[PDB]
Amino acid sequence: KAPGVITCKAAVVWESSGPVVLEEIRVDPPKASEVRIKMLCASLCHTDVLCTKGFPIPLFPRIPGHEGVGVIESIGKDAKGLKPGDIVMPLYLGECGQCLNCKTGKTNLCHVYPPSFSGLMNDGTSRMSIARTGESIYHFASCSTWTEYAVADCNYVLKINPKISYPHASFLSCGFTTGFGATWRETQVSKGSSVAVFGIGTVGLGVIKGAQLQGASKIIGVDVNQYKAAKGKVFGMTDFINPKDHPDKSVSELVKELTHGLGVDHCFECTGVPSLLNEALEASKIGIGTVVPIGAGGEASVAINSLILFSGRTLKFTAFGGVRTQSDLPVIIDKCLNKEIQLDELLTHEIHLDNIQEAFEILKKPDCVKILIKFLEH
Template sequence: MINSINCSVVETVGDEVKNLKEGDMVIPTYIGECQECENCISGESNLCLTYPLRLCGLMLDNTSRMSCRGQKLYHPMGSATWSEYTVIDVNYLVKVDPSMNPAHASFISCGFSTGYGAAWKEARVERGSSVAVFGLGAVGLGAISGAKMLGATKIIGIDTNEMKREKGEAFGMTHFINPSSSDKSPSELVKELNGGMGVDYSFECTGVGPLLTEALEATKVGLGKTITVGIRAENFVPVGLLSILFGRTLKGSIFGGLKITSDLPIIADKCIKQEFPLQELFTHEVQLTDIEQAFELLKQPNCVKVVIKI
């Protein structure tokens, strides 16, 4: 995973900005939190209605603040962070302690925090429960870490990359499954590790369509809960109907259900206190001018996070 969102330093602020100043260290985010709309006050959703996720590449007023040679440029995910400079609405920024490692701050701008939040805010993993995590990239490792922090006693990581076993164990994984070494399905292998029963919670972090049904099937009949956070290339994926009819719950999640004002600072504080082994994510680093190299690095089996520096 290339770190698409980042950690930045404020260059200048607009006249109406009161809570930030030049030189502040910030994390750009792709959702906001007004703490006043129906979703914010519900306590059940992080999808603010006042400062929503912008997929159109434009600011809230449907204009762009960037251009090149007279041509309008767009703000991907509202933040345009694969750039040296960007303009962003202040409501999509989180100020962090300048003592924080910038690379670690960038890891919690997306990726790791998405998985951690999925366990913490979406699944609300209970102490003593069992968990299966499909895909051990930064998101999956975050889900493992969140499950561990919440007291899950059996945490099963599933990945076809054998090198992810060590990474998973560093974050709290108790069992590892490599489906490519067996003729059985991933869900069957999960049940074998749990006495023939499914797990209490599963997290689909790969974006691979067929694994969504596998993640559902890996949970307990009647009680299992699956959180899907993996981004898929296709908009529609088939889901096994019986997997749902047998009482399991499937829940989608953006940014792991985290609210940027209420929740992200808590994770940032845990990072500063070194409660997560985030250095395990930092496997490669390239300059922004060499960003094409970053895409090649993603093909290497030992790659977890590529940090892009300016």
């Protein structure tokens, strides 16, 4: 009777740009409006690298990770229908549906459930401890995933179909879903339009497969790596551009060559490199172009050419690709049940949490796209 304290393993980082030590932690039971999760899958992202380097807010010790999927192990009072056994996916932000921003239908940034950055629960305390010393550990985003057990608020999790493959649901927790949703929530790629995707990572592959299903004629993929060029061709990419092959020319005028000088209709910057947002703007059409800066950079500011302010383009800032976690997100997950979008080519590497120090150097490999973290039940 009544759930209790859970002890398990987790990935913990103690300093900025420091090592990720696997620690024996102590997870408290879930209190009011909270649920406890047993992790099934996890994944990496550049955001997780920013978390280990103190960006945006340096909080330590921390259990990184935000991409993942799990099963409800225990619930508190007022779990809003959530029960043990439900396969849930952590959310970057909820959707009450009744706030001023949710009723407009033009944004996914709910006023009641915004993204979290305190690294703690709503009551200012942490559910997770160090089983040896007792130091409370900050979680990440709204729920850490690089841990065997985690506690999260019931409004920051989404109950999903028990049929979806658990690696697939993890790849839909952040990267691919953000790139997919950006092609019809922030800016709407119409039939027979030009689209240039800067950086063909898991976020870029979502935009490519996104622009195809909407009917984009030209889908330009601009990445440093030939290894990722082939994986873009499978999701519907029409043209490819490599900045190394032409050092005298910039990426902006390289896209302007394949588009008859006009540029593309929608640019999706997915790398976060500071020099590339200015190239994304110049790559879009004059007057009717649109740029969606999806990639996140590690520095506090971003510079834009002052003459672009006269170019009449549209700079649509975004979070989670504009996907509404309660309205639009379940629509994307069922598209892998019908396999309209198929996410098998995303997985390239696989590790277990015991070798999570390995994952940071694995993501540096040129042939790397997605890293899946599994948990051995022992």
